[PDB]
Copies of this chain bind each other. A is one copy, B any other.
Amino acid sequence: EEEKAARLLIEALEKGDPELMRKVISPDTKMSINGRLFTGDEVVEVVKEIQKRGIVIKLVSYEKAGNLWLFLVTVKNNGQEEKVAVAIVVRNGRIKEVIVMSI
């Protein structure tokens, strides 16, 4: 169920299907994206905005410790490329906390 949620996140991101995230986000999910805080449905709306903008995300690598996952992705928009770290904590099959940080 832990692994399910992480796997669904990757699939959702690859597919550009933000709505699929609703299967792993909860109303109490907290996200920090470069210091900006979002909760619950707002997290889905942020991911939707990212997809709407056509931002291209490629997974580079990932690691896991217990219910904690850390992903390194490359992000491309308008020919500019950046590395981003995405940390998630899963509880009861749901992503409860997420940090997105530009490197």
Q: Does A61 contact B (CB under 8 A)?
A: yes
A interface size (C-beta, 8 A) = 27
Contact B65 A30 (CB under 8 A): yes
Contact B66 A97 (CB under 8 A): yes
Determine chain A's interface SS by DSSP, over half rule.
Answer: strand
Q: Does A67 contact B (CB under 8 A)?
A: yes
* A72, chain B: closest CB distance, angstroms: 6
Q: Does A13 contact B (CB under 8 A)?
A: no
Contact B97 A63 (CB under 8 A): no
Contact B103 A68 (CB under 8 A): no
Contact B85 A72 (CB under 8 A): yes
A35 to B61, CA, bound (A): 10
